Design a protein around this ligand. Structure first.
Ligand SMILES: *[C@@H]1O[C@H](CO)[C@@H](O[C@@H]2O[C@H](CO)[C@@H](O)[C@H](O)[C@H]2NC(C)=O)[C@H](O)[C@H]1NC(C)=O
Ligand SMILES: *[C@@H]1O[C@H](CO)[C@@H](O)[C@H](O)[C@H]1NC(C)=O
Ligand SMILES: *[C@@H]1O[C@H](CO)[C@@H](O)[C@H](O)[C@H]1NC(C)=O
Ligand SMILES: *[C@@H]1O[C@H](CO)[C@@H](O)[C@H](O)[C@H]1NC(C)=O
Ligand SMILES: *[C@@H]1O[C@H](CO)[C@@H](O)[C@H](O)[C@H]1NC(C)=O
Ligand SMILES: *[C@@H]1O[C@H](CO)[C@@H](O)[C@H](O)[C@H]1NC(C)=O
Ligand SMILES: *[C@@H]1O[C@H](CO)[C@@H](O)[C@H](O)[C@H]1NC(C)=O
Ligand SMILES: *[C@@H]1O[C@H](CO)[C@@H](O)[C@H](O)[C@H]1NC(C)=O
Lengths: 271, 271
């Protein structure tokens, strides 16, 4: 004979106590504490309000329910002959929400990464991790990634839910792995005299590779002297040749290096 | 936080609740049922009466406490600011008392006797048997005596207690062993003529042995004829001879007999 009255936190709880005509006295109680005895306010809490005092039902109201309001409320009333009690157990449901999540982390390829997602809620919320680029789901507060590769990098989303009608409140974290440059594309030019030409290197790196060009032994300085100018991009570096020059012909090597490694390839310029 | 108020069954229980001046409301509660709210009677039981309504203490009384009154009584009261509770747990003690005990028993020596002492009480009382004359104790509701002897006869006391502040209510039973008479002492007289003499026998028996005197063949009748008079006691019987007589000289036999046996010894009267 213990009924369950579950409410979502912050809402209004209404406690009705239905009685017959022949009731001598009636009151609602907080655990063992009296709130209202008939028209008598016992509780000094301004949230406890009296809704209905009909000789057929005796109903009160609790405004702004908190976690401290969880308890056993009884409605002890009396007839001319025998006493009575009808009890109701108040349960507060806190909707699930993420309270702490890992900061945007950066690691080197082949590293070991641990992501934590702390979420609170009544009942116990279910924390679930997810990778945006690739669909992988792990039902756990923490997620570890051992010897991560470049493709596994991206945004990692945490979602939590306690099954309530409330929204899950998912949040995302971006993981960026560092990898050394590997030269994917190399172009060589063998052009005739009079026409412009260009050499290029494609090496993708994080942090973006610092590209170095080498003419045989020496390296280029991107100066107007010798009529050469290099254009640097995040994933490429084009070596541009204005007009032509007799000396410009020869072996060339580019070098792409970041903090994690280096790479180099040799291309030529012929006629 | 929880006090114990143990009462013996049938007495008066009084529940005081001491409060300061700044109390908006006050009430006593039996479990979750309101008994008295201020000056307002909630309980329909005429045994609950309100003794004191001082703004300093709020005390009620329960007349004729029963086992059904055992419970947790709380005093929920209110100040202008916060509620309060001071609780009291009612405990009923049934005092130990003997309801059945053995009647005064009689047995023959070497017999087997069983004495039972049935005692009631909550909690379960501890029954202990005891021998009054000689210190012997048996911690058991029943006491058995194998091959009962003469010295073991006497009063056997039963005592029971439940540890309460109540009295032990001890009772006694008398055990009387019957034993046949065994003649312990016999005296013969060899007196001269003119002087008085006496014969006696000592045989203790229960029930007291009926002593018989025999002069040679015949038996004495304690008559003034022949000048003889016998004095019989519980443990002895003296055969008294006043002055002398020629016929008085000769063999004599005494006999002590009860319900369990007889005994006889031969003494003489010489010159
Ligand atoms: C019954 O009344 C007591 C009064 O102390 C409540 O206890 C406090 O309630 C408030 C608000 O809910 C909390 O902030 C406090 O932490 C609680 N404890 C104390 C020591 O003040 C109790 O919650 C009430 N019970 C119900 C079911 O309403
Ligand atoms: C009330 O809630 C408790 C705790 O979840 C549960 O054990 C019980 O079965 C519930 N009763 C009802 C009637 O829902
Ligand atoms: C709760 O009651 C207050 C008081 O009337 C009202 O303003 C509020 O809108 C109510 N909220 C809900 C969710 O019932
Ligand atoms: C390229 O050739 C044009 C035409 O002959 C000339 O005007 C210009 O100066 C040359 N520039 C370079 C960098 O050689
Ligand atoms: C330059 O390239 C040519 C042709 O590929 C090669 O023969 C020569 O060894 C390279 N190096 C130098 C310094 O000329
Ligand atoms: C009441 O009795 C229990 C049981 O022994 C004890 O733990 C508690 O301290 C007692 N309370 C008081 C106020 O004596
Ligand atoms: C106990 O309660 C009875 C109830 O009738 C009352 O008459 C009596 O005065 C009370 N006090 C004592 C000491 O018996
Ligand atoms: C107290 O409550 C119990 C249980 O409901 C009930 O049996 C008893 O009669 C009530 N009154 C007293 C004085 O114990």
């Amino acid at each position: 004979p213990a009924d369950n009255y579950t409410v979502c936190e912050g809402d209004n709880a209404t406690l009705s106590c239905f009685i017959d005509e022949h009731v001598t006295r009636v009151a609602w109680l907080n655990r063992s504490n009296i709130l209202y005895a008939g028209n008598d306010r016992w509780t000094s809490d301004p949230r406890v309000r009296l809704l209905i005092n009909t000789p057929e039902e005796f109903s009160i109201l609790i405004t702004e329910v908190g976690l401290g309001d969880e308890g056993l409320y009884t409605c002890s009333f009396q007839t001319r002959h025998q006493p009575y009690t009808t009890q109701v157990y108040l349960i507060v449901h806190v909707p699930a929400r993420i309270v702490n999540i890992s900061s945007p982390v950066t690691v080197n390829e082949g590293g070991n990464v641990n992501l934590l997602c702390l979420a609170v809620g009544r009942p116990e919320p279910t924390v679930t991790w997810r990778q945006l680029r690739d669909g992988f789901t792990s039902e756990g507060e923490i997620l570890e990634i051992s010897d991560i590769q470049r493709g596994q990098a991206g945004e990692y989303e945490c979602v939590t839910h306690n099954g309530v009608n409330s929204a899950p409140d998912s949040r995302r974290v971006l993981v960026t792995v560092n990898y050394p440059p590997t030269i994917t594309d190399v172009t060589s030019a063998r052009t005739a005299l009079g026409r412009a030409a260009l050499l290029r290197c494609e090496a993708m790196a994080v942090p973006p590779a610092d590209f170095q060009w080498y003419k045989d032994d020496r390296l280029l300085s991107s100066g107007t002297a010798e009529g050469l100018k290099v254009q640097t991009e995040r994933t490429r570096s084009m070596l541009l040749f204005a007009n032509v020059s007799a000396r410009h012909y020869g072996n060339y090597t580019c070098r792409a290096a970041n903090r994690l490694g280096a790479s180099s390839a040799s291309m030529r310029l012929l006629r």
